[PDB]
Symmetry: D3
Subunit: 172 residues, 6 copies
């Protein structure tokens, strides 16, 4: 019997300063955070309707650089789906993506972990990572790619909702 | 791909005067209709959330008292079979509604809920136990309702949606 | 703001008083006619109470349970308690004292958010008068609400009132 | 041009103790008030959907007996529709209804004022006003009658929603 | 009396590849479809509140080039309002608009059919159709013009809600 | 006791043509108004959820250039103010200090909930630098948000941020 809404555990990962927090806060509060306040670990909750199903999103916002690596392994084990975020004006953040992905696959001992590749800050004019390169990378992993802006809200709901759909597909 | 909410086609049947319209209008408008205006055929819609899933209920309210009857039985996915707990004849009619539905749909396992309406009234002629035994014999849920007090109204419709979902 | 406020509610009272039926009416808008004894079950629902969005975590307990350290442990997680009796069952009403003492013991406090709930008000076999229950609640400084899980009278109100009691305490 | 939801100013009137406040608080908070705390004047707001239209209910809960009569005139002038409440166990409250209706018509200087007759406390066993008598009275005025219980919530939404429907009919005249 | 929400039958028309599907999917799923999968015929539904009225939108997503022309006439007869979509980087799609409009008017035997002119892909830098020219075209038909991006979601709700308002004006 | 949702009286001020109406209509109707129809006075309402609290927003849309007793009246009744300039209109930005001083004078307070709004951020012809606006907002101790009534960038955020500023002030 139904005891309450389905819950999804989402984890947002990626390099320092790519906009992990800004994406999450835009989703939760409809607020753009202009300041750069480095994260240690924050967790958020939101109830949404996706494809006609009520969902409770539990979202873990992670540090760009995680010092205690056992803590990183713990959230990778518990997370059901991952947003892997880079910034489209930060080539290094893009090159870091494969490390996040490998870490997740290693910890979960699986090649098929729900994930979405997110190219954030698409509102900025100084793009250094081409859409084509990101799409090719996502295709090589068999995952969706979405361009986002925490500032304009382009793609924000879509990135989170797409990840829930990937989790749902994986469980079906 | 998701093209919009799930739709459920529900049909409310039973003898004249048992409260089919009053149940439906209570669900849709939160209004109790005190007058008895016999129905020909009316259809209503409401979006609800049941067990975390959004769905569009299409509800067909039928006349108590035949090609038109067959047509709505064919299109219906689930049926509320309503009698009034102060009307023994309406209860005895339930067997006929059930057989008609099974015949038309060519199925033994058609989502249905047995509804004993007007449970607010003191002059009960149909025992709860008798209705429960009948529902058990059909393998369907039984619910007592009052379109006047709203007791069991949402439950009757939501239960029927749950029966459709089980069947699908 | 990291998301809605959560409230941990625990439903206690004697065997058969309608703790599960009240909870399932809240969650599913369904009346359960069958009596399936509970050990421990948990439910969740988001509601709006006094303009504030709340996530309710509801723990539905066993009415017949000997001393358990494990019982004490889950009860200690509760922020507020519905203490339920049935208005046709005098012994369930007399057992309310025991539930109240248990809650005070486990929470190690005299001031625990609670609501007294007199369930099955639809039945003709009332043995506990409204005034007696109101007097008991007044003696504890808590609200009394009469409910019927069958008609749904007072169901939302019992849970929402408990949330208001928790908010007052915080 | 849409500037936000339509607002309806609803006023709840009737004799002392008939359950005006209990009805309103049941609507607003889903809470039954067992205590009898006599009202002076309180205002409540709730957004609801009625017949597919979103609207803001501004509800003025009044005193049974209003001492300052200019204050009474003021809310009757501003009110767009009125719930006239009696209690089904209180014959005097029912006999008062005609006078509340006449007071409203006098203040508004109109014969066609949106109103609903509400017979409250229908959960109680010692009924002194028969349903038929209330229905006959409502029919004589051309208005809806609804039986309510602020305790069980029977008819509560219906009473308020029906009044909004009466206001809409009057406005669409 | 009231038997449940008002239903509006909306039809999305225009040249191949202008973003008819992408607009509809953005509205329904808050998802941007990056791939180009040519449509035959798809129908979608959504309940929304527009100007305080609860509406059930039935949206018919059409093919750019309709081969069976009796099928085209049938959906034009049943549709209550039309989004006529072009892409602001595709001059040909803009020059085609008058053909779609004439088809609709011919089938409905009316000069007063609820319609909105939609200039889609306004996120792209390679604009070939000037806003002023589109506004002038809309003005010549007596209909609203809205610039949209199925990608950023700019104007998407507005285009559909504006069409519902046009239908309501025609019904009253 | 709870009598229904909390109401917030918001007032939108700023020079003629900066997009006060367009911002408000975007919020209320999800509609971008392309035409320039000068405002006299309009009031709008919307119920929203902000940080888990249901709020009724009462929004007063004002004339760029005002009868000054009428101006004083809405400034007295307003609980919070969006002070709007257009990022392509230097003069509208220079006017901001006058609106702020008027509000502080009328409300006889140095601590009035306000948000500085740089509107039309979709346009390419920017004449007011973000740094200058941020410095000005910081000098007043208020939030700064860039908006576009056209793209809807920042629109909800401007109004919701102002409600959060009012809530902070009311404790
Ligand atoms: N223009 C623009 N700036 C953005 C966007 N997302 C984030 N930023 C900015 O980039 C900076 C870093 O954002 P932040 O969310 O803190 O990054 P983070 O990835 O959470 N960092 P950390 O790993 O240290 O926790 C902030 O100044 C923020 O305003 C975006 O989409 N567009
Ligand atoms: N007391 C009470 N009266 C009820 C209840 N349900 C319906 N009624 C009353 O019974 C009468 C008939 O109800 P109605 O809805 O019209 O019945 P129906 O089954 O739709 N009739 P038909 O088959 O002619 O369309 C009315 O006077 C109505 O108010 C109920 O639960 N309790
Ligand atoms: N008439 C009526 N029966 C009720 C009501 N609430 C519960 N019941 C019935 O009482 C029986 C026991 O209810 P239930 O919810 O299982 O009780 P419980 O308090 O959860 N029992 P346990 O402690 O063993 O888990 C069931 O048959 C149920 O239908 C009520 O308000 N009215
Ligand atoms: N049983 C029952 N009691 C009710 C009902 N409505 C109100 N009461 C009770 O009757 C008493 C008076 O109710 P209240 O709402 O204060 O009445 P009022 O009309 O607002 N009084 P006043 O005119 O002084 O403000 C309270 O004790 C209340 O609990 C009802 O439907 N059922
Ligand atoms: N950048 C951008 N691309 C868009 C936009 N809308 C659509 N596209 C892209 O344009 C292509 C065609 O879009 P699609 O929705 O299939 O077009 P259509 O009008 O439905 N095609 P058809 O008539 O064949 O069914 C896809 O690659 C899609 O991603 C938009 O607003 N911006
Ligand atoms: N590109 C763009 N144009 C905008 C934006 N906001 C407003 N405009 C345009 O600017 C013009 C003036 O907008 P309007 O809302 O009337 O300004 P106002 O500040 O309310 N004027 P007034 O003080 O006379 O009432 C209109 O043509 C409108 O479309 C925006 O964010 N971007
Ligand atoms: Mg961070
Ligand atoms: Mg009928
Ligand atoms: Mg139990
Ligand atoms: Mg009162
Ligand atoms: Mg297509
Ligand atoms: Mg203006």
């Amino acid at each position: 019997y139904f005891q309450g809404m389905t819950e999804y555990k989402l984890v947002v990962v990626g390099a320092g300063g790519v906009g992990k927090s800004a994406l999450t806060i835009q989703l939760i509060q409809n607020h753009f955070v202009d300041e750069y306040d480095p994260t240690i670990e924050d967790s958020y909750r939101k109830q949404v309707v996706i494809d006609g199903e009520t969902c409770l999103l539990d979202i873990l916002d992670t540090a760009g650089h995680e010092e205690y690596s056992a803590m990183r392994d713990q959230y990778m084990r518990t997370g059901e789906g991952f947003l892997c975020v880079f910034a489209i004006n930060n080539t290094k953040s893009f090159e870091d993506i494969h490390h996040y992905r490998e870490q997740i696959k290693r910890v979960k001992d699986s090649e098929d972990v729900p994930m979405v590749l997110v190219g954030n800050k698409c509102d900025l004019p100084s793009r250094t990572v081409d859409t084509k390169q990101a799409q090719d990378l996502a295709r090589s992993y068999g995952i969706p790619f979405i361009e986002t802006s925490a500032k304009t809200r382009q793609g924000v709901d879509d990135a989170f909702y797409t990840l829930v759909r990937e989790i749902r597909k994986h469980k079906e």
